[PDB]
Design a protein around this ligand. Sequence first.
Ligand SMILES: C[S@@+](CC[C@H](N)C(=O)[O-])C[C@H]1O[C@@H](n2cnc3c(N)ncnc32)[C@H](O)[C@@H]1O
Ligand SMILES: C[S@@+](CC[C@H](N)C(=O)[O-])C[C@H]1O[C@@H](n2cnc3c(N)ncnc32)[C@H](O)[C@@H]1O
Ligand SMILES: N[C@@H](CCO)C(=O)O
Lengths: 376, 372
Amino acid sequence: TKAGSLTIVGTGIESIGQMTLQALSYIEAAAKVFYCVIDPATEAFILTKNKNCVDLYQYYDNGKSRLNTYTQMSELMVREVRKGLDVVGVFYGHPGVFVNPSHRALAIAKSEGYRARMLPGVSAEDCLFADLCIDPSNPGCLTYEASDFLIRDRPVSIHSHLVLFQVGCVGIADFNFTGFDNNKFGVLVDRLEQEYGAEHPVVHYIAAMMPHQDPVTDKYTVAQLREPEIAKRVGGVSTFYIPPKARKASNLDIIRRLELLVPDKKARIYPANQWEPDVPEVEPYRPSDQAAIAQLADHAPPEQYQPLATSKAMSDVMTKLALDPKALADYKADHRAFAQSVPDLTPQERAALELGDSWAIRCAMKNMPSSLLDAA
Amino acid sequence: TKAGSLTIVGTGIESIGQMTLQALSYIEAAAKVFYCVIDPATEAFILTKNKNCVDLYQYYDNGKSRLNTYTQMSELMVREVRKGLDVVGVFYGHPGVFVNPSHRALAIAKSEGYRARMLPGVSAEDCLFADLCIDPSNPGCLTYEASDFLIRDRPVSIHSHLVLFQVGCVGIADFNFTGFDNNKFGVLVDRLEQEYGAEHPVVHYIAAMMPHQDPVTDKYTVAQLREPEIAKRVGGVSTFYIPPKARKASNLDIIRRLELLPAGQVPDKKARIYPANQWEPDVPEVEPYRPSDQAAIAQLADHAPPEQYQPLATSKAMSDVMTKLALDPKALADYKADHRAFAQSVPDLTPQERAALELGDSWAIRCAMKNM
Ligand SMILES: C[S@@+](CC[C@H](N)C(=O)[O-])C[C@H]1O[C@@H](n2cnc3c(N)ncnc32)[C@H](O)[C@@H]1O
Ligand SMILES: C[S@@+](CC[C@H](N)C(=O)[O-])C[C@H]1O[C@@H](n2cnc3c(N)ncnc32)[C@H](O)[C@@H]1O
Ligand SMILES: N[C@@H](CCO)C(=O)O
């Protein structure tokens, strides 16, 4: 039961708006905050929400290895944990997606016997899916760091989505405040041409940082990436999306074993991927679609559909547990004592909260029968 | 321009807390809200924020194809757009990650000339990285839908992370209110055994849905997945993580072209980055404080900010308006329509700040907020 803890949170990519409610609540409650963001409005916002913040960005330098910077960032955080304080680290995007020092600091804290947790956030890949209008499900997604992709000769799959981070710093171990001199970029272009061909599309993607900005979603051929004026547009916040070159055929034995039967591989569900070369759009309103739409006119909810049927007192406390870290800590320490303290709950509601199981909370908030809960 | 718009937003996975500030503000501002979420506290919260909501979940049914439900969900949203309304759709997690009807509705709205946008959210994969303590960077990540993975015989990489969604409904095209009868699950287990071997680990992952819950992070062998009591635990909110078998060797041409090692020295001999992946079988222990780490820590005592580091140096008025543009959708729409007229209306801005806002470029905003 050591005093001291480390919680690392994200801010998302687009200024302020892409932070989660829980990231904000933990920042506000912290004894000490350490942050690494690249948007001045987000920095200003953080400084209005906690009185004891330190900017980690000052530990980068011209010609200084990023690994040295990361060791320093982690040590600054853990030093405050060792003094018995509740410390929060903040990184832009998702704090564990292409971020070294967060994973390091949490592992050191855990090894010394302190509580340590990462809260997820909205990454640049999350933004890419939203802005390019693609789903990782169709037809699968491979995600790599650009230098690692080359050095370990990581496998390509020409039938799935490909996403490459850190294309602006190929083979570069250090930092510069004015930007990278990305003079090994041509090595990446050679690999892409060898796998996909000279005329295959590469989408240069930069998510908007400020709320009024449009994203950069510029299509180039692989061969165009050798032109000096195009290559120089690729910087420190650039990600590449490379769409599929072909569609993979279905396995007939698997279709038999799953029992689904010939399958046309070039037969798409609406909408088609706009970035695939020479792929026409599909029909949105086939006869099967029109039949489903006609059924709306006299639709009734199924008998097994259970509408929400809660109270203000119950919704208030469930919201409080999600938005007030201190209330959550009190509940976790003593479910029974906490449940007895909440004003205006019914006997059914109070018993369900003491248990805290999914089945019990659902019975209470949807007015479903339960012999135990109705006996309260 | 044409009246009517569609904005689709997410709620994250863990109840209420994983919703973004902008998802909340767009829900509040909407003329009508359509939602599909799978816990009651999140549903109750949404209903406190807008008086005009419809639950899309009522359009599922026992034995009804999910494709028919998806067509209906998308049509209810687009019908309201065609009436000239600003409509918001809401899906749990990230609204475009393993979600069919959002992409469909947005594509139809855009093709008919209406404004259409998706706002990203926190997905189950984002939660998985945070709870299992892994980074997609190290050593790469492949992500698939479980049935698609099987039907198209999609490749694995034994040297990278593998993440499989929808492992609880293999080959199933319909819906049931009481849950799926996942009787083709053995076909997935056979494929995993062929690619990885019977004793390789598979992590059964379920992110906590309520704020007091712990995640499920249960490691099993591929062979253990054939045991009835274990297979029964895999349901509609289950995801699988399969760690690498081993570390992959480096390409020698690439080491030379990137100038990463002098000739005559043996490659792939540096220790792994700390910390090691705790799920990878036979992973060696990595030490946190090597000589290079201890030297960096010694330098902290007399560290000064570099000359090129630019401290924030802004004002209440400028910070307030940039926050407003992020948190008030109406204010953002006004600003976008006429930058000059909006910037003239803002109270207490300096002439430098007012001009910077009127331009709106990143270089201009940064100049104003760091006093350069
Ligand atoms: C050090 S990593 C940090 C990523 C971050 N934690 C996240 O969640 O996306 C930096 C890389 O993230 C990607 N990135 C950062 N900001 C971006 C943006 N606005 N648009 C596209 N990619 C971005 C680029 O690939 C960049 O080289
Ligand atoms: C229809 S999809 C929707 C995914 C959602 N949009 C997201 O952003 O994660 C359903 C699948 O998501 C995954 N999933 C949903 N909730 C989850 C949870 N609490 N933990 C782990 N995986 C989950 C499972 O693989 C499930 O079969
Ligand atoms: N990962 C590096 C470079 C990203 O381009 C950083 O720490 O910013």
